[PDB]
Short mmCIF file of C-alpha atoms and ligand atoms in Angstrom, two decimals:
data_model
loop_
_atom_site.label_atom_id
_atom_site.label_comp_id
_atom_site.label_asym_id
_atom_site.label_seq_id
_atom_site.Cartn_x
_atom_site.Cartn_y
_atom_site.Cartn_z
CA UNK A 635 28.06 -37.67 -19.27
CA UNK A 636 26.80 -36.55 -22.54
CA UNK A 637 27.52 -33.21 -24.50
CA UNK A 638 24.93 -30.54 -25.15
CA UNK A 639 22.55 -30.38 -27.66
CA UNK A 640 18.49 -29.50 -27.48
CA UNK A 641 15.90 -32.51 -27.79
CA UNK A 642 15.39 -33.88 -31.34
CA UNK A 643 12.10 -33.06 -32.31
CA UNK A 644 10.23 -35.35 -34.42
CA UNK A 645 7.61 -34.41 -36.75
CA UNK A 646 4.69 -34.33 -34.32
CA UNK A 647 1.92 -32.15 -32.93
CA UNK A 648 3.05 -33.39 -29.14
CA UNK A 649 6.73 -33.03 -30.17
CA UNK A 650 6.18 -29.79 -30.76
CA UNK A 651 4.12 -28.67 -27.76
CA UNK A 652 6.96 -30.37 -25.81
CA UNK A 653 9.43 -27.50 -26.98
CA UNK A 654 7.26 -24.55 -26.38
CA UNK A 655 5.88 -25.38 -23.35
CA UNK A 656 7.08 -22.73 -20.93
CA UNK A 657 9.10 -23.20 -18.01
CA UNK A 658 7.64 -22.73 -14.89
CA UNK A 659 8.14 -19.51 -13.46
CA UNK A 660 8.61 -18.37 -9.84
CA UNK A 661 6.91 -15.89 -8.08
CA UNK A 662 10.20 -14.06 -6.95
CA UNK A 663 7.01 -15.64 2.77
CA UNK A 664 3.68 -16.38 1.92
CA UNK A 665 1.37 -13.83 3.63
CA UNK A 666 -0.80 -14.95 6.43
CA UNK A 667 -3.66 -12.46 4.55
CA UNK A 668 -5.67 -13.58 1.99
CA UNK A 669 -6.31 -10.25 0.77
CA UNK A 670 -2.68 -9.92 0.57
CA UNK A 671 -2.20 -13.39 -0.91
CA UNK A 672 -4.69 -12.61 -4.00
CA UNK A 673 -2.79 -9.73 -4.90
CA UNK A 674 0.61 -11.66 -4.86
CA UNK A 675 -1.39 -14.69 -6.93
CA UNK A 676 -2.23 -12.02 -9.82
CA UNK A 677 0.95 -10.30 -10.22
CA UNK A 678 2.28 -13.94 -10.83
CA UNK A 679 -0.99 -14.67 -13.37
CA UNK A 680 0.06 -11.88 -15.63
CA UNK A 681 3.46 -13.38 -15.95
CA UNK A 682 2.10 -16.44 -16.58
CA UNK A 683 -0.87 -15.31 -18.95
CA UNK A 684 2.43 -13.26 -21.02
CA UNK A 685 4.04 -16.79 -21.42
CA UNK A 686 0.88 -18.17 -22.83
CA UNK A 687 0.45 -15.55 -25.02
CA UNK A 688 4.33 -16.07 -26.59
CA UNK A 689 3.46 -20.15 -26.16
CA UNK A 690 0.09 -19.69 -28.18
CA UNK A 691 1.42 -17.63 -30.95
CA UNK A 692 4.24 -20.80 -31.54
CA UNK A 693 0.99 -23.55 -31.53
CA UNK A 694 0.83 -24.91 -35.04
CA UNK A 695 -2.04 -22.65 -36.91
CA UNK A 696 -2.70 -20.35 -34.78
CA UNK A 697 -1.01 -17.93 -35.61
CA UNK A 698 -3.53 -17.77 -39.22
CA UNK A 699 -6.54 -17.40 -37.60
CA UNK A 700 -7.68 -13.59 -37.73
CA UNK A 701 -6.09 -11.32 -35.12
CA UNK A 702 -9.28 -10.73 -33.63
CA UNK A 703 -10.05 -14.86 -33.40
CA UNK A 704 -6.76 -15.36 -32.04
CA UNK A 705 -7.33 -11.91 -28.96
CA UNK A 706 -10.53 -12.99 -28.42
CA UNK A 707 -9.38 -16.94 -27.60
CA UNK A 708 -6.89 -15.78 -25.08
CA UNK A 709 -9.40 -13.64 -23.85
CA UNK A 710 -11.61 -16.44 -23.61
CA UNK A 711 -9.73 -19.10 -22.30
CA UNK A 712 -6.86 -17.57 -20.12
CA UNK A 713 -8.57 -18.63 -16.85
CA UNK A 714 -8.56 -22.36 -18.15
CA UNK A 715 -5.00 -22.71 -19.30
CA UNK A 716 -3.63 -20.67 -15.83
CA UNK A 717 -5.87 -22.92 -13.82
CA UNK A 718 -4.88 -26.23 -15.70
CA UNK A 719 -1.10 -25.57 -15.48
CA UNK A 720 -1.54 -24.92 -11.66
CA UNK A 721 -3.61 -28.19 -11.60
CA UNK A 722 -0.64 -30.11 -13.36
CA UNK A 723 1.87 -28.34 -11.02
CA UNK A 724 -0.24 -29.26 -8.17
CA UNK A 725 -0.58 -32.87 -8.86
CA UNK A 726 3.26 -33.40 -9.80
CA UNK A 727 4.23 -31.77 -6.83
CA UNK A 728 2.11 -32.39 -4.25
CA UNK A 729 -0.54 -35.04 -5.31
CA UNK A 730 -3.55 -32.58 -5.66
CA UNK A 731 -2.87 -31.63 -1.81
CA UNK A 732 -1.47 -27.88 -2.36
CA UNK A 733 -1.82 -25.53 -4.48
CA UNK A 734 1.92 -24.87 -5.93
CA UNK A 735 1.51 -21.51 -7.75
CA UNK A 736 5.32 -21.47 -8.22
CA UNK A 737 8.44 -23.45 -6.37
CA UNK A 738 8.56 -20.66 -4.47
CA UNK A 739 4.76 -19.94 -3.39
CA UNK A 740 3.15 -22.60 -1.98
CA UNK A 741 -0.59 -22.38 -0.42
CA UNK A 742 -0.66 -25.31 2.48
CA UNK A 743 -3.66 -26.21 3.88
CA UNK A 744 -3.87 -24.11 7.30
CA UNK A 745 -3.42 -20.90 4.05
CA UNK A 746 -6.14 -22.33 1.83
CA UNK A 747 -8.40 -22.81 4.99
CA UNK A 748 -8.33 -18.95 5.58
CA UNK A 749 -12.10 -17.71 6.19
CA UNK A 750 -11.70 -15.82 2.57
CA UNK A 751 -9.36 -18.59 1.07
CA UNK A 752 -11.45 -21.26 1.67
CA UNK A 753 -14.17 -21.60 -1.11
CA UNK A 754 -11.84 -20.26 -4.02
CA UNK A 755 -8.70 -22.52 -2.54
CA UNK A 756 -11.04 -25.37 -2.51
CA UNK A 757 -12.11 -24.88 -6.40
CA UNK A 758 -8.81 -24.09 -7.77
CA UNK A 759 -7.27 -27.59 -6.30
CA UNK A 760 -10.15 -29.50 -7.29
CA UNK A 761 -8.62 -30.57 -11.21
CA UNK A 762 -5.33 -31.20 -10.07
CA UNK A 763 -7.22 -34.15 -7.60
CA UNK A 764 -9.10 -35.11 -10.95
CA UNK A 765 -5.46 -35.12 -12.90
CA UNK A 766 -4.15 -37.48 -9.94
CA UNK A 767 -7.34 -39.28 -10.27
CA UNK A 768 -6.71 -39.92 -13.67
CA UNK A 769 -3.20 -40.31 -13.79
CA UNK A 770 -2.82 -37.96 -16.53
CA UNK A 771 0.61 -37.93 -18.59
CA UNK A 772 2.50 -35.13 -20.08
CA UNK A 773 1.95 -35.96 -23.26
CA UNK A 774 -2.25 -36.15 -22.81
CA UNK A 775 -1.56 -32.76 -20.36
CA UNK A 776 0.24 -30.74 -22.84
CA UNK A 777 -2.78 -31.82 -25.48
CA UNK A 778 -5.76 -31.07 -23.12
CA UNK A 779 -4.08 -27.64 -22.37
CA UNK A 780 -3.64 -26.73 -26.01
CA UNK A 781 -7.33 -27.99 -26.60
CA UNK A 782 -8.16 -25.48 -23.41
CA UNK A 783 -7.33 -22.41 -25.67
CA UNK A 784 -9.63 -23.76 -28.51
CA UNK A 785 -12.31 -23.99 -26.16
CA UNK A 786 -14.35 -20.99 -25.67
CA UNK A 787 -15.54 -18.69 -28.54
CA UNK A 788 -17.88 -16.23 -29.43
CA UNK A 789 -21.55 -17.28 -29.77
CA UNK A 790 -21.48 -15.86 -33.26
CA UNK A 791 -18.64 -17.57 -34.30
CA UNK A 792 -15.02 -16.89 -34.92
CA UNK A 793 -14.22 -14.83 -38.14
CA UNK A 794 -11.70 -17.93 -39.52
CA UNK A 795 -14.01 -20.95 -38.48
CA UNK A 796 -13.16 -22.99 -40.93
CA UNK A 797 -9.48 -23.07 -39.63
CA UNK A 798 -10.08 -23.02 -35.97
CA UNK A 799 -12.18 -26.60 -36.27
CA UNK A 800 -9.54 -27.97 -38.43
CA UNK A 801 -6.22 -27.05 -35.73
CA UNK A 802 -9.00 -27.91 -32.80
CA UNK A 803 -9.78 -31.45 -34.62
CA UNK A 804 -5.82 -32.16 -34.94
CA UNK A 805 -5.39 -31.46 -31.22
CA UNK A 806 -8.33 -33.90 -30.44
CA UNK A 807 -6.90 -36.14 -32.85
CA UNK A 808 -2.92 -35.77 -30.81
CA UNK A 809 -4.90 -36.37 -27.53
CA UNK A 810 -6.08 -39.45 -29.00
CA UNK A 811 -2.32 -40.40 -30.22
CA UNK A 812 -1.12 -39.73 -26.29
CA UNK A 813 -3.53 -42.10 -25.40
CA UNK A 814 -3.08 -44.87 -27.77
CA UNK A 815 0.72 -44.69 -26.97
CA UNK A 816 0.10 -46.08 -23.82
CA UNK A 817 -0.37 -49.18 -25.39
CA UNK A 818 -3.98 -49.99 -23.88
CA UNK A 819 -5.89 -52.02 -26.37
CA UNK A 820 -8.89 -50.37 -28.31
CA UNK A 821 -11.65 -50.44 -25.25
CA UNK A 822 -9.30 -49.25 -23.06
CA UNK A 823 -8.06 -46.52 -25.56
CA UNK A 824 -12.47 -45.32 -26.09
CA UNK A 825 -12.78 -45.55 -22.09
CA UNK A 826 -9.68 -43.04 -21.45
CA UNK A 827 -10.74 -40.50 -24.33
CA UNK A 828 -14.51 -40.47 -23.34
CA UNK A 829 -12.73 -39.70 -19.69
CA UNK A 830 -10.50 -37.26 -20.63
CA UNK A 831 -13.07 -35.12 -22.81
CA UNK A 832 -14.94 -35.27 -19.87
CA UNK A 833 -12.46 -33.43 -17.51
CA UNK A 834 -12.01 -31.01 -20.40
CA UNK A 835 -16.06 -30.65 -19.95
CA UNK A 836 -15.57 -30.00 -16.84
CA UNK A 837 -12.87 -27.46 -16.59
CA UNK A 838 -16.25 -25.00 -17.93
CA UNK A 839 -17.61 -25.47 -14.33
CA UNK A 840 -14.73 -25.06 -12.26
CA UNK A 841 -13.58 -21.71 -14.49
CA UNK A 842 -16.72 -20.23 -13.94
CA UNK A 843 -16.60 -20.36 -10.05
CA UNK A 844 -13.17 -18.64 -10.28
CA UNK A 845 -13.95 -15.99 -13.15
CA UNK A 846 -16.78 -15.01 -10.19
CA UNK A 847 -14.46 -14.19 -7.82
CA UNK A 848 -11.96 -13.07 -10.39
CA UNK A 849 -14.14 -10.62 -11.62
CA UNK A 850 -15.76 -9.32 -8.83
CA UNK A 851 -11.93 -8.66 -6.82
CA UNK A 852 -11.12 -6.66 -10.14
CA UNK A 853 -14.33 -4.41 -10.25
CA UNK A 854 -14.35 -3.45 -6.55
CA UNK A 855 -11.85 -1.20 -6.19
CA UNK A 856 -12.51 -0.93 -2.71
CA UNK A 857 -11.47 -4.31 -1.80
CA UNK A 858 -7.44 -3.26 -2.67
CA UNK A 859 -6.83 -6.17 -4.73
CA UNK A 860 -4.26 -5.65 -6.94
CA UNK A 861 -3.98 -6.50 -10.46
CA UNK A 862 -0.90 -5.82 -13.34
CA UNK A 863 -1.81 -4.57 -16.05
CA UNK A 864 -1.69 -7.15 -18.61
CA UNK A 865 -4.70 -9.28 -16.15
CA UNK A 866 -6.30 -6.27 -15.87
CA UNK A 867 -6.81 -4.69 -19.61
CA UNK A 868 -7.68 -8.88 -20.52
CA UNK A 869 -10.54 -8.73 -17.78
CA UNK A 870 -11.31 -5.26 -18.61
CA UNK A 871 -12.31 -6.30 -22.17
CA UNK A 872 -13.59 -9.89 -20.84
CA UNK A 873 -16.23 -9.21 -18.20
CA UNK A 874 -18.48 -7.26 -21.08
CA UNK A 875 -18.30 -10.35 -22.93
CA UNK A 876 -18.88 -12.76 -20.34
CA UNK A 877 -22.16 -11.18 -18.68
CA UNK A 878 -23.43 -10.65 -22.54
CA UNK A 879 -23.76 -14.09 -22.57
CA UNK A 880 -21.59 -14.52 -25.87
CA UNK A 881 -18.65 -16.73 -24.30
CA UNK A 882 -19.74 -20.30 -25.92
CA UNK A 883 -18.01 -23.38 -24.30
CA UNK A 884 -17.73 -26.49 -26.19
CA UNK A 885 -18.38 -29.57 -24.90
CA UNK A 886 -17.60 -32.82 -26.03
CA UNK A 887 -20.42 -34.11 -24.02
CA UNK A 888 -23.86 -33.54 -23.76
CA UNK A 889 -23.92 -31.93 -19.65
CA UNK B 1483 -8.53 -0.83 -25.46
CA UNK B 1484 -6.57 -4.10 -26.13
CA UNK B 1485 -3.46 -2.85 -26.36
CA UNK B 1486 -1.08 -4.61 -24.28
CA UNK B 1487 -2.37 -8.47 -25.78
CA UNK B 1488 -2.47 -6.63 -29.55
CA UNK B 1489 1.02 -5.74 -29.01
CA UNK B 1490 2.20 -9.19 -28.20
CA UNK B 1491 0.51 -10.83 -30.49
CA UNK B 1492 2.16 -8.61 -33.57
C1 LIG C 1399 -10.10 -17.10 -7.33
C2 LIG C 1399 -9.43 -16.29 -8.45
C3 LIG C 1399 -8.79 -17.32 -9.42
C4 LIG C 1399 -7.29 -16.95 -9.36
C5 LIG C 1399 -6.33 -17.30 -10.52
C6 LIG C 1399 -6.35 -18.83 -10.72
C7 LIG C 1399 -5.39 -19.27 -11.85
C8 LIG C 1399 -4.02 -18.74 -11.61
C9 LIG C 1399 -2.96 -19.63 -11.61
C10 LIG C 1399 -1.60 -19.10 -11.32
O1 LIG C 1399 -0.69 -19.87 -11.32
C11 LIG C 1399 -1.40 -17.66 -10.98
C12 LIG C 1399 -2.49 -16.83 -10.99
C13 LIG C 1399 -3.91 -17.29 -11.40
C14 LIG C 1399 -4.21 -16.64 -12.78
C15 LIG C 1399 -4.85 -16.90 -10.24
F1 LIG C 1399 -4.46 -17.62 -9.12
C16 LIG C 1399 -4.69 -15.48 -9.74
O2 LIG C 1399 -4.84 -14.54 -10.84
C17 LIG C 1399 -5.74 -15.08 -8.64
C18 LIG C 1399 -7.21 -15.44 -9.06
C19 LIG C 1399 -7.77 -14.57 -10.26
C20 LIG C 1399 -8.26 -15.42 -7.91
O3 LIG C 1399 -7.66 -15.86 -6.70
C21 LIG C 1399 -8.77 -14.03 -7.58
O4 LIG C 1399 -9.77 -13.54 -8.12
C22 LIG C 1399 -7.92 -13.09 -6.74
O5 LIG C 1399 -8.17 -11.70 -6.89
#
């Protein structure tokens, strides 16, 4: 028995992303359509994308980066932070085996074998198998995530560059501190952050398979997916971007 | 044309 009080934070990057992480939200019987399904899944990705809009604005420096950096890296990088969150969920809840959207929506395996589930099912469960792979901790998840919306910016540059490498260098630089924590000694500590970097690399791949589908269920209007609004005036504003070529994705690696 | 994200974000 102990009395109330909220967590003592400490004076800490990871501390920090600890308090402002949001809480998972539910989606408030799956649908044995997945036309149906993908509708369902975006009404619950603008709620999310909201919450990492509110989380974003509370990551240390962010907020001081021009207003057009800062719309233009949510812009850039929702798709990577909804799709590493459902990898976490996915791999704390079921191993990498389902995709767990919410508590309450759950995609089993007969759902994400669906003839039109299938191929995106298969690539939005593939990083939570690489998270179980890797045994990734909270503290090195909530650090990769953060370094997710730092991750893909205009070819040209962002208007407060100087800023954005500095807050992007301390998150590399708290990744490293989740690691060392462990307590691995100095081989072990290179080998984990050389991994790590690399499943950041490859979160690029994975994202573009689902911004395909993403974009092409928005444009279609035909094909009576649904999308709220907040998804849809981001993806509005996205796609001209995108097939312009001027998304740039960094890479730690070479990839 | 960004309205929504501009909004929460001020
Ligand atoms: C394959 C794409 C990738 C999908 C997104 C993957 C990331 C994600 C995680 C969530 O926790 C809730 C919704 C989203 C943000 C998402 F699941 C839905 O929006 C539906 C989505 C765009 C998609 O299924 C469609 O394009 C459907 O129209």
């Amino acid at each position: 028995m102990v009395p109330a009080a909220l967590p003592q934070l400490t004076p800490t990057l990871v501390s920090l992303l600890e308090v402002i992480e949001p809480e998972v939200l539910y989606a408030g019987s799956v649908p044995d359509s997945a036309w149906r399904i993908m509708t369902t899944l975006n009404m619950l990705g603008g709620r999310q994308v909201i919450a990492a809009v509110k989380w974003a604005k509370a990551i240390p420096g962010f907020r001081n980066l021009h207003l057009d950096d800062q719309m233009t890296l949510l812009q850039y990088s929702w798709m990577s932070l909804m799709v590493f969150a459902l990898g976490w969920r996915s791999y704390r809840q079921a191993s990498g085996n389902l995709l767990c959207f919410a508590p309450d929506l759950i995609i089993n395996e007969q759902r994400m074998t669906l003839p039109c589930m299938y191929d995106q099912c298969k690539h939005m469960l593939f990083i939570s198998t690489e998270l179980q792979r890797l045994q990734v901790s909270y503290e090195e998840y909530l650090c990769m995530k953060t370094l997710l919306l730092l991750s893909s910016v205009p070819k040209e540059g962002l208007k407060s560059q100087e800023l954005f490498d500095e807050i992007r260098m301390t998150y590399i630089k708290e990744l490293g501190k989740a690691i060392v924590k462990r307590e691995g000694n100095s081989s072990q500590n290179w080998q984990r952050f050389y991994q790590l970097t690399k499943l950041l690399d490859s979160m690029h791949d994975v994202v573009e398979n689902l911004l395909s589908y993403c974009f092409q269920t928005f444009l279609d209007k035909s094909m009576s997916i649904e999308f709220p609004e907040m998804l849809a005036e981001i993806i509005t504003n996205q796609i001209p971007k995108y097939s312009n070529g001027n998304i740039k994705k960094l890479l730690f690696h070479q990839k | 044309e960004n309205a929504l994200l501009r909004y929460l974000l001020d």
